[PDB]
Scaffold this motif. Structure first.
Motif, PDB file in Angstrom:
ATOM      1  N   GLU A 137       0.831  -1.203   0.000  1.00  0.00           N
ATOM      2  CA  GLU A 137       0.000   0.000   0.000  1.00  0.00           C
ATOM      3  C   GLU A 137       0.870   1.261   0.000  1.00  0.00           C
ATOM      4  OE1 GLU A 137      -3.217  -0.099   2.819  1.00  0.00           O
ATOM      5  OE2 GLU A 137      -3.328   2.100   2.956  1.00  0.00           O
ATOM      6  N   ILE A 138       1.929   1.234   0.799  1.00  0.00           N
ATOM      7  CA  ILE A 138       2.929   2.294   0.823  1.00  0.00           C
ATOM      8  C   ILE A 138       3.530   2.501  -0.571  1.00  0.00           C
ATOM      9  CG2 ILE A 138       5.243   2.876   1.649  1.00  0.00           C
ATOM     10  CD1 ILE A 138       4.455   1.493   4.340  1.00  0.00           C
ATOM     11  N   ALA A 139       3.984   1.416  -1.189  1.00  0.00           N
ATOM     12  CA  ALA A 139       4.544   1.476  -2.537  1.00  0.00           C
ATOM     13  C   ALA A 139       3.571   2.150  -3.506  1.00  0.00           C
ATOM     14  CB  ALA A 139       4.892   0.081  -3.028  1.00  0.00           C
ATOM     15  N   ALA A 186       1.192   4.240  -2.754  1.00  0.00           N
ATOM     16  CA  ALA A 186       1.110   5.662  -2.424  1.00  0.00           C
ATOM     17  C   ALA A 186       2.272   6.452  -3.043  1.00  0.00           C
ATOM     18  CB  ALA A 186       1.073   5.862  -0.915  1.00  0.00           C
ATOM     19  N   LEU A 187       3.440   5.837  -3.023  1.00  0.00           N
ATOM     20  CA  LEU A 187       4.640   6.452  -3.599  1.00  0.00           C
ATOM     21  C   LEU A 187       4.500   6.609  -5.103  1.00  0.00           C
ATOM     22  CD1 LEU A 187       7.271   4.625  -1.339  1.00  0.00           C
ATOM     23  CD2 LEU A 187       6.991   7.119  -1.634  1.00  0.00           C
ATOM     24  N   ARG A 188       4.031   5.558  -5.768  1.00  0.00           N
ATOM     25  CA  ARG A 188       3.722   5.629  -7.197  1.00  0.00           C
ATOM     26  C   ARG A 188       2.700   6.737  -7.504  1.00  0.00           C
ATOM     27  NH1 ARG A 188       3.679  -0.128  -6.661  1.00  0.00           N
ATOM     28  NH2 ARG A 188       1.384  -0.188  -6.737  1.00  0.00           N
ATOM     29  N   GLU A 189       1.768   6.939  -6.580  1.00  0.00           N
ATOM     30  CA  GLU A 189       0.772   7.989  -6.713  1.00  0.00           C
ATOM     31  C   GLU A 189       1.451   9.349  -6.591  1.00  0.00           C
ATOM     32  OE1 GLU A 189      -2.741   7.450  -4.266  1.00  0.00           O
ATOM     33  OE2 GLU A 189      -3.486   9.468  -4.690  1.00  0.00           O
ATOM     34  N   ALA A 240       4.561   9.882  -7.372  1.00  0.00           N
ATOM     35  CA  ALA A 240       5.339  10.038  -8.603  1.00  0.00           C
ATOM     36  C   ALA A 240       4.503  10.677  -9.702  1.00  0.00           C
ATOM     37  CB  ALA A 240       5.882   8.694  -9.077  1.00  0.00           C
TER      38      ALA A 240
END
Lengths: 25, 23, 27, 25, 28, 25, 28
Positions: free
Chosen positions: E9-11, E13-16, E18
């Motif tokens: 979920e964290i990953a 969020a990070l892609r979001e 980006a």
């Protein structure tokens, strides 16, 4: 421990990021 | 704990990133 | 737990960062 | 779990970070 | 596991993050 | 393991965050 | 360990982020 050290390595990178943000300025 | 301490060092760095906004 | 606590601290720092970028851009 | 919960709070703070950028565009 | 799911979920969020920064930038 | 793999997914998203900046200039 | 290893990869990603940010600041 290897995990704690990697985590501290994450902290330092973030501080490196902080100096880059503080290159605006 | 060493792991907890290091996680706290991460938070501090993030706060530092935040303070660098203003600054 | 101290680990959970520290992770929550990290969550709070990121919320700080969100606020700060929000404000700086709002200018 | 408390750890999993805290990790999800981190993800939501990151989404907040994202949204803050989505309103600067 | 819940822990691996939370991390994924964290990953995401990070892609979001980006994506948002690309748009923010592109808005210029 | 599933945890290591998810962490590696996190690193990749951060690299994607980096690429977003490399493309700004 | 594979977890320490993945954490180190995250750190490297963050340094990659810092560097791209400096190039940003420098290209203006």
């Amino acid at each position: 421990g290897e995990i704690a050290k990697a985590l501290r390595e994450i902290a330092k990178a973030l501080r490196e990021x902080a100096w880059a943000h503080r290159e605006e300025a």
